[PDB]
Amino acid sequence: MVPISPIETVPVKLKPGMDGPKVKQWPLTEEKIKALVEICTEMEKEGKISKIGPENPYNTPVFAIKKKDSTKWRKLVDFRELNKRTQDFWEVQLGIPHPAGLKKKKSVTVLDVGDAYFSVPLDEDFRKYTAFTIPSINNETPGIRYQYNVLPQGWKGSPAIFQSSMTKILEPFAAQNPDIVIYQYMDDLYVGSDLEIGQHRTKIEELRQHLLRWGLTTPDKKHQKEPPFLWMGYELHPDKWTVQPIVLPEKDSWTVNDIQKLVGKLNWASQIYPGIKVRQLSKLLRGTKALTEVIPLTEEAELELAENREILKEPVHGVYYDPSKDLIAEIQKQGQGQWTYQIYQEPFKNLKTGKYARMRGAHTNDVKQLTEAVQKITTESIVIWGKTPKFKLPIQKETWETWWTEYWQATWIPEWEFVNTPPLVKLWYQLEKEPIVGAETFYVDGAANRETKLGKAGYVTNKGRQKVVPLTNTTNQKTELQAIYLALQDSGLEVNIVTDSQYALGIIQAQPDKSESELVNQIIEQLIKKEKVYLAWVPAHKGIGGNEQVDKLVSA
Amino acid sequence: IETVPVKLKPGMDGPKVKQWPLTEEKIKALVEICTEMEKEGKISKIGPENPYNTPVFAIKKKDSTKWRKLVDFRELNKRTQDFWEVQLGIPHPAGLKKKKSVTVLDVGDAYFSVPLDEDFRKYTAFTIPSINNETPGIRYQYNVLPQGWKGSPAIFQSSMTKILEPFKKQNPDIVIYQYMDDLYVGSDLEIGQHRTKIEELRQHLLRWGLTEPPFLWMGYELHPDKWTVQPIVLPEKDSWTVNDIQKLVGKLNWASQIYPGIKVRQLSKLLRGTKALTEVIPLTEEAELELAENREILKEPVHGVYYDPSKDLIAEIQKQGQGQWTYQIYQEPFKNLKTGKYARMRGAHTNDVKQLTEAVQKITTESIVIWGKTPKFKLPIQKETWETWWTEYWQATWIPEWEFVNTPPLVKLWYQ
Ligand SMILES: Cc1cc(/C=C/C#N)cc(C)c1Oc1nc(Nc2ccc(C#N)c(F)c2)nc2ccsc12
Ligand SMILES: [Mg+2]
């Protein structure tokens, strides 16, 4: 006997105030009972479970499931109730590595750690809550009562306790072999290195020797799995990676469900396939969530899908991360609030790709959206590579400096350089800081009756120009915008505009270049056409003539 | 040497806040710092039975060259009991803001000499994350009073009063205030002697420390007696255009929400007709009289303005351009307790967010000196831009609360 170190036990509690499960054992056929008795006898010899006396008051149902195309039965203990009352744990696999942050490896081995999983003991004070009962033959004897001594399959805490136990065992081996990497996933350890294959597997046997300390055995006949690996949706290769094949179905009619898989596949493919777009295909699902409803695909959505089919026509591969080189991120505008990007270190060899979609709002502009895309790529890059990439952006240095120095909010984007690949982001209008000399001055106002919805909008100017337009199905806020629209329509290339609408100011001072409101969009297109516009605000009902005059004209 | 029992507020569990992503250099800085702390017994590895978490990152204090561990205990502080068992609450020294020099000391390392209640330690769990999740996060919990936790200065106050008792009796004119990891030491002496009156303190707690603090050497010096305010000022002109008078009336109308007798009809009556914005308008004497009376009103304090310690302080900030920022602290709208202005945004000529980040810390520092607590900020910035970058320029050991303003206020014009 070679002594083996015990595996440190994790103390487990139930949720505060909760007691263990007390669920009644379903009746079973005599055939299933004999099956479970033989299965549980083997596990008792293996030490996985132990018979208990009648004093234990807890119970969890056990089932026998007939396997497909076999004469053998499997055992299933249903820990759904116990899981509801087991304390929360620290789960470690919430974050999973992205292949673009991995490093190139010459050799990668896979070792099965499934028998090692059962050397992890369950907290002795907690085992009583895992009790289950095999029903007896003809219900004429007391049922056989067992409790688990090891982490039960399907129990809430088994994944977290298992990997945290393996990590503790593997830590000194990894720390004293910094020329290999070890990563655990499910029942498998992955060991990679850049060593010549000779030394690489001495290290593998050194890992099996280290695992023997705790009596953990790995299969001698080496694993059947080898590069490439099919892992969490990717294809991992020695020096490149890709998502698993993306196949878009052919359909003459698409349902609500049919589009959510298509967008799902497109979202997954967008991390390496450049330029994937999902706007017109996601729009077809807004509001409605009727799994069966068929949706006519707009010719916009048909074009977007056809554009995606052309991009997905072949495998596209990305490379792994080289910490000795810079990260470069490059963004393009796609239209309709869509942005696509590539992240690379050497030209034409992307590490990964991605996309960003405009947030939902009443108004927006391209500079705000590009800024948000930069922040998303920045955070993703901190996640994946632990650094911010240098950016190449479709915006001139002069446009950005004009934007951030005049914008009312604080804003910043990290180190970047202009790349001249249209469509470029630009500023479409710039309001003046001081009133314009020689330009006609427009005093605008509008009002509406909150019951009849009837309103008026118009202006009066210093040259005697006047207009009042009667309106139907409108509001006070809409008439205040229409009045500004009229003054822009009827003025020359330079104009001063005086309004009392705090609502209109707040919109225009946000500097949008596109809006959900077709009236704001019309104002924007008038602003683009002007050379100089000074927009001044005065308070309402305060004796300010021009304002007061048109106030009476529109509120009559 | 004895642990004081600490528990959370009734019906509340420990914090479960996600660690945000960290750069490589902060991760490695935290590994070095936490490895030594584990050797010195300050922290200990924890297993998966601990589900709680509090975010951690690393900073560099103002002109320091080595990283400092900073834990965002804002959620744990909200969930921790409030300490009134020994003291009903230290009455905030109103005389601290009147001293001509106030030095801020990082006495946070002193809290590591006091053990933490063993039943409460699970709630201080934090995670050093890994890049790309290529290894499990390094999980720790605290065995001693942690820096940044509101219960650390409350428990250690037992000790702290006894450490500086020789100093307080030797120097009865020096005002000493403790907020979190900070010690605010105020005096009216001469500048040269002020340092002299700082190191002496410093040498004390290093003498109690050897019976070395990695940041006790430094002093952040202020002068709250020369803290300037911002009353409401109206222009003084010889030629008023229509635009000037419209801006003036708009400003006086906003001030009328704050002041009682503001009046604008004589000034508004000059704006009779439909005149060009750049046309010069002579003032009637009724208008100048009205302007003169409004000017006198704006030189008096605001009526009914009092600080209530039971209510939150609120700080608004406006970007004014050219590196200038205005701010107002209040508890109810139009009842400003302090207003100010900063053109002193250091090393950030090309960075709006660094400027805003230094202004936030500047306003918080003033708020601690005056009222002994931090305000909730209304920041003129998008949530996504601020949360991406503020930790890069943070140099204080506390962290306030903040919300975000997405609609441009008209009020920027009135403090411009
Ligand atoms: C070794 C391994 C295996 C897997 C197994 C997946 C499955 N099915 C997963 C991870 C995350 C793995 O971990 C890593 N891998 C890589 N580099 C890499 C390079 C080439 C190949 C190939 N061929 C590869 F597999 C991985 N770098 C790092 C750096 C820190 S840990 C890690
Ligand atoms: Mg009106």
From Swiss-Prot, chain B:
Motif annotated as Tryptophan repeat motif, chain positions: 386-402
Result when mutating residue 267 to S: 21% loss of polymerase activity. 16% loss of RNase H activity
Known outcome of mutating residue 149 to F: 10% loss of DNA-directed DNA polymerase activity. 22% loss of RNA-directed DNA polymerase activity
Disulfide bonds: none
Effect in UniProt of substituting residue 393 to L: No effect on RT p66/p51 heterodimerization
Phenotypic consequence of residue 152 to G: Complete loss of polymerase activity. No loss of RNase H activity
Reported impact of residue 181 to A: Strongly decreased RNA-directed and DNA-directed DNA polymerase activities. No effect on RNase H activity
Effect listed in the UniProt record for changing residue 398 to L: No effect on RT p66/p51 heterodimerization
Reported impact of residue 386 to L: No effect on RT p66/p51 heterodimerization
Effect the entry attributes to changing residue 389 to L: Almost complete loss of RT p66/p51 heterodimerization. Complete loss of polymerase activity
Impact reported for residue 185 to A: 37% increase of DNA-directed DNA polymerase activity. No loss of RNA-directed DNA polymerase activity
Positions contributing to Mg(2+) 1 binding: 106, 181-182
Effect of residue 163 to D: 16% loss of DNA-directed DNA polymerase activity. 24% loss of RNA-directed DNA polymerase activity
Result of changing residue 61 to E: Strong decrease in RT binding affinity for all dNTP substrates and in catalytic efficiency. 100-fold decreased sensitivity to ddNTP inhibitors
UniProt-annotated stretches for the region RT 'primer grip': 215-223
Name of the molecule in the record: p51 RT
